[PDB]
């Protein structure tokens, strides 16, 4: 019923590929069902390396949703995620549904980014934060469903 382009954003090693692979490659069509309605996601992966940063607007143009992924064990990945958020808000459609995915939550000894910082950031910027694990499947299905729930 509802067709939506979803862009995935995040620097290398955050878990961008692992997450879409656990959920379902650089491109996927994925159909979900919420509340008597159908959502078919077109999912666009993007290159997360800094040298390719200026190319991303080509990919996130017209997107109805974005998952911005970071690695909770890597503070720089969180800094990168915040910049994506600012950019999408400066230069993306105000209607876009943004999800902040905090990946590799299963990793205990290694965690460097608190849920408070991430949650607080998300709350002040009109998005939602969700801890995920591709490894254990925690919140992988849910984050895509929560996007599809929120689509206008």
């Amino acid at each position: 019923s509802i067709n939506a382009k979803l862009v995935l954003l995040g620097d290398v090693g955050a878990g961008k590929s692992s997450l879409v692979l656990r959920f379902v490659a650089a491109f996927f069509s994925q159909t979900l069902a919420v509340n008597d309605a159908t959502v078919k996601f077109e999912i666009w992966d993007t290159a997360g390396q800094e040298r390719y940063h200026s190319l991303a607007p080509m990919y996130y143009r017209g997107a109805a949703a974005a998952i911005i992924v970071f690695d909770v064990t890597n503070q720089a990945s969180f800094e990168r995620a915040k910049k994506w958020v600012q950019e999408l808000q400066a230069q993306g459609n105000p209607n876009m549904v943004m999800a902040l995915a905090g990946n590799k939550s299963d990793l205990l000894d290694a965690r460097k980014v608190t849920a408070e910082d991430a949650q607080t950031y998300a709350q002040e910027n009109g998005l939602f934060f969700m801890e995920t694990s591709a490894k254990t499947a925690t919140n992988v299905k849910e984050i895509f469903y929560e996007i599809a729930r929120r689509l206008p």
Binding site: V12, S17, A26, S29, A47, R51, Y52, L55, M58
Partner: protein, 246 residues
């Protein structure tokens, strides 16, 4: 189409080709005119009493056949048809003919784990076929074939190195490398031409995604300097000079 049956489709196509030349060439106006004609003619293929009749596949092929026939007749007028496209084509060829001589995978963040020993030669060759065809669809097929070949070779490397199936992080830099190595003539004009003249209902989905990858690859390559391929400035200019000498 050669049937005495469909003669009035043939007259309609022929009088579009002749009446297209009446207008002064202008890309944005020309492509709007072609897309409108494609929309009207395909609608006419479907609704015609004599075609009532045909499968979706048969209708899709007729659409492509029409795209091929019309675009072949219009080719010299609409393809690389002005000074700025000619200039942009040549700037890009010149850039790549220099950089191809010295660029390596690590300059583009291609990890050793995803190395291919042919340097993805078959993908290079698929891309290079682009100027053997006139129809937007067949040009786009060269790009799409390039992309599939790359994706299959990336999958094999990840199979051998026991890692995740390649995403965009792996794919795009390799497309860039492959495009630089292939340096297909009039790359700028080819991509603009596909964008303007491919049947608009067909530039969607996965095709649109890999098309966007090559557009972004074109953009990256046009803008290549020392920093964008992680080389010291002096090292970069040194390499660019030796490329000219060769």
């Amino acid at each position: 189409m050669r049937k005495p049956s469909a003669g009035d489709f043939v007259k309609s196509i022929k009088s579009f080709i002749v009446s297209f030349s009446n207008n002064a060439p202008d890309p944005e106006k020309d492509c709007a005119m072609v897309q409108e004609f494609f929309s009207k003619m395909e609608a006419a293929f479907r609704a015609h009493p004599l075609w009532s009749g045909c499968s979706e596949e048969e209708l899709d092929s007729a659409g492509d056949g029409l795209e091929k026939y019309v675009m072949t007749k219009l080719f010299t007028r609409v393809f690389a048809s002005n000074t700025e496209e000619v200039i942009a084509d040549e700037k890009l060829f010149q850039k790549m003919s220099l950089v191809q001589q010295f660029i390596s995978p690590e300059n583009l963040d291609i990890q050793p784990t995803f190395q291919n020993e042919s340097s993805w030669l078959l993908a290079q060759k698929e891309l290079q076929k682009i100027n053997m065809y006139k129809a937007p669809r067949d040009k786009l097929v060269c790009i799409l074939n390039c992309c599939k070949v790359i994706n299959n070779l990336l999958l094999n490397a990840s199979i051998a190195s026991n890692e995740n199936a390649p995403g965009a992080n792996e794919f795009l830099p390799v497309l860039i490398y492959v495009t630089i190595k292939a340096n297909p003539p009039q790359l700028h004009s080819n991509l603009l031409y596909i964008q303007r003249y491919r049947r608009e209902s067909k530039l969607v989905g996965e095709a649109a995604y890999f098309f966007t990858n090559i557009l972004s690859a074109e953009s990256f390559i046009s803008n290549i300097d020392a920093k964008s391929i992680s080389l010291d400035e002096a090292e970069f200019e040194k390499n660019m000079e030796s490329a000219r000498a060769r």
